């Protein structure tokens, strides 16, 4: 959804320390030491949606395609999200 550039302050600095500390628990990069958070820092808003997503193998014009359709839970309205192909038979 909406994207926003957030200021570089104590809150963003604590986020960096939170990420590095959580990454050290995994140990993928060993034991890192947090230095600082630099610009740009981005804040993306996540919009909620409750429903289903049907992922189908469809034959169109004698070719196999991969189509993804979203459907809202309360409204049951659907939207085509993706349509790719041809793809090999599963």
* Total residues binding a second copy (CB under 8 A): 57
Asked whether position 87 contacts a second copy by CB under 8 A, the answer is: no
Residue 27 tokens read as 């140990």
Q: What minimum distance in Å lies between the beta carbon of 89 and a second copy?
A: 8
Q: Which residues, in sequence order, are CB contacts of 24 under 8 Å at separation 6+? A: 31, 32
Asked whether position 42 contacts a second copy by CB under 8 A, the answer is: yes
Asked whether position 76 contacts a second copy by CB under 8 A, the answer is: no
Residue selected from 10, 36, 75, 88 as contacting a second copy according to rule CB under 8 A: 36
Asked whether position 39 contacts a second copy by CB under 8 A, the answer is: yes
If phi > 0 it is left, if psi is from -120 to 50 it is alpha, else beta; for residue 76 that is left
Asked whether position 19 contacts a second copy by CB under 8 A, the answer is: yes
ω into 40 cis (within 30 of 0): yes
């Amino acid at each position: 959804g909406e994207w926003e550039i957030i200021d570089i302050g104590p809150f963003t600095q604590n986020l960096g320390k939170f990420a590095v500390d959580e990454e050290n628990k995994i140990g993928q990069y060993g034991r890192l030491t947090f230095n600082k958070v630099i610009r740009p820092c981005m804040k993306k808003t996540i919009q909620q949606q409750q429903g289903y997503e049907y992922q189908l193998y469809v034959y169109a014009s004698d070719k196999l395609f991969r189509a993804d359709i979203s459907e809202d839970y309360k409204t049951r309205g659907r939207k085509l999200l993706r349509f790719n192909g041809p793809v090999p038979p599963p």
